[PDB]
Amino acid sequence: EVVDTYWLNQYVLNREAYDYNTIQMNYDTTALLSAPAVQQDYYKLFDGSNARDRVLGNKARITVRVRSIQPNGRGQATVRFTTQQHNSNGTVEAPQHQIATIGYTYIGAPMRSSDRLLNPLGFQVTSYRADPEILNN
Amino acid sequence: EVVDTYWLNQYVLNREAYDYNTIQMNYDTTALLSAPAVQQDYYKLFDGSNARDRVLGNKARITVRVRSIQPNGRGQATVRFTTQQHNSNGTVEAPQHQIATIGYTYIGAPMRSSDRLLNPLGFQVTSYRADPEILNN
Amino acid sequence: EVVDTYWLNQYVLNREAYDYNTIQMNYDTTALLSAPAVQQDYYKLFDGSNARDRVLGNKARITVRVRSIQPNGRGQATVRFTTQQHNSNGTVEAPQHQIATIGYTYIGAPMRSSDRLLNPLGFQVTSYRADPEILNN
């Protein structure tokens, strides 16, 4: 649980977050921690006219933080986290709450210096979804 | 070597780097990966009139990247990395080259959710120094 | 000049510096970058009742940084550097200024993994001295 929750946290934070200035590392890291199917789903978020690269670009940024992760089975865990948007005019949008479900495995140590210094454990997401949390409190 | 080089990289990058917007996490992470002696040396960099918080503040930022890490013994490794300063006027200072020497151990898994989700392995720096690299090429 | 100044810097810094925690690497590195005559002069600094290992031990440490290196001939260069002593009570002694004169050559690549990963070029000091700088400014 300790090791898996770390990877699940780092995966969600980097995947969901955005900053023009650091995204290249978060982008490559997310891919490094994703199965090709998952990598493609992720890559597509930066494509077309509605691309994160065009919508947020260098005008707005996304901050992500994980509150709690609890494994529930055989390659599966639930991640409870929040997200918020900041921008160039100094304003901040109200924070949203989201929950990710992550299917995962490990593929063992990678054999490239550019990969082992980022994901030595071989963490890999095989399935991913994240829905809005409804705060029925 | 794979696991230790990761921790040594993340330690140096977060320790040496600075961004008003993300430093609270890098600051706490550095402390989490540092022996109290080391933590104090680090904390002091944010103190007084020459504090990183006042010198860089929200006017300038530091970008750090590690090129190569090679362990050399019994709790000791050499980290070769670069650093550069960016600012609010859109300018960039010439990059500098530096080499860190890190003495380290591991203290095992921590027993707080706020620590295990950042340093589950227990990485801890017990000694740290970083000098300018002289590019006698 | 670029390559030689690097080796001259790394040699002086590691030779003159001291930290109980990292000295084994600096010690072996210095020897790796020294002619047997030079290695012996160096080894002797850790011998007897006035040994660096007993004087500094784990109570005090030496920090060394090189300001400038300028080659002057046929296997010879001048290294301008500073040094300071720190200790366990949290105090720091006033920094001193020193100048080293280094006679040197290269012996080509070494044939042991423990040597090539530290001195692949074969840098070797054949003569060494360092005197106090008199700041007649």
Numbering used by the authors:
A (entry chain F), B (entry chain E), C (entry chain D): 95 to 231
Q: Paper's wording?
A:
In Gram-negative bacteria, conjugation is mediated by a large transport apparatus—the conjugative type IV secretion system (T4SS)—produced by the donor cell and embedded in both its outer and inner membranes. The T4SS also elaborates a long extracellular filament—the conjugative pilus—that is essential for DNA transfer. Here we present a single-particle cryo-EM structure of a T4SS complex from the R388 plasmid that comprises all four sub-complexes: OMCC, stalk, arches and IMC.
The arches (the composition and architecture of which were previously unknown) are composed of hexamers of homotrimeric units of VirB8peri, forming a 177 Å diameter ring around the stalk. The arches, comprising the VirB8 periplasmic domains (VirB8peri), also form a hexameric assembly with variable occupancy. Six VirB8peri homotrimeric units come together using the β1–β4 sheet on both sides. Near-atomic resolution was achieved for all except for the arches sub-complex.
